[PDB]
Amino acid sequence: AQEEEAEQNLSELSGPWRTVYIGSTNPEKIQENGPFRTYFRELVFDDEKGTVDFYFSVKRDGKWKNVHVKATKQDDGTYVADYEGQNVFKIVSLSRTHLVAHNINVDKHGQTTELTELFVKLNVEDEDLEKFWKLTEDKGIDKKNVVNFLENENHPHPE
């Protein structure tokens, strides 16, 4: 017998995520305009399908693009996904607060690059949303006159 099945419950982890650090064996890949200079926006874990959907922004030729990539868990435990080539990636450490992964990318030229990354979750608690809503009610503000900044078609550019 090899290893045994892993009880996986990461659904709890879906939500807003941000990129802290991304390291690379090939710096050109992460330098400005690089394909893996990805600013995470959201992550969605599905335990039924055993998938991870990545939502992130990347600048391509002085222009910002919002990308969506779906990764699928393999019986190996790793995940594979198509983005600027082929990737096999591995969650080395994941918790409600963080995420450290190792990705191996093979581009359209067969060039292999190993990347490392630290990502953090933007945790918005219920106890706090309530407190903000109450206050907002008290001050007589209308829910319609409130702007959601954690998801809007008009935000700042990291560069």
Next chain:
Amino acid sequence: EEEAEQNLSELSGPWRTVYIGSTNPEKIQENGPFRTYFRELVFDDEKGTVDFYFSVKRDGKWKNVHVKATKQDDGTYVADYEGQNVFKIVSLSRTHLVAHNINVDKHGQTTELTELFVKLNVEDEDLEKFWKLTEDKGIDKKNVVNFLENENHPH
């Protein structure tokens, strides 16, 4: 296992805006001066102040703004930004900030806004784990980009 000491200044660092509500919708609509995307906050216990670092789009262009708020003996804060402001922190932890602000603009108009902000905490253990992983893969520290500081210092 291990947690840093609790300090006000220790809450200093990257913060992000979640929601902001207003009595005058024009203040937080596109191009409104209060449609502020927080980048960082620095609490200073000695001077009794809070420094706001945020971004706001004006005349179609994103601008980086810094505002120094000063605590009052009564615990609230004053700050000059698009008129005079009297800021009140209704709840604050290492995780969140809920606050009420009253702004009177240069023309004497009064707007009351509410806001919910959240902090981006990057824990030591996770940082070291990223670097350990990074050196295990033979990646040189000079070959790593700090995305968080870029986000905190856009343009």
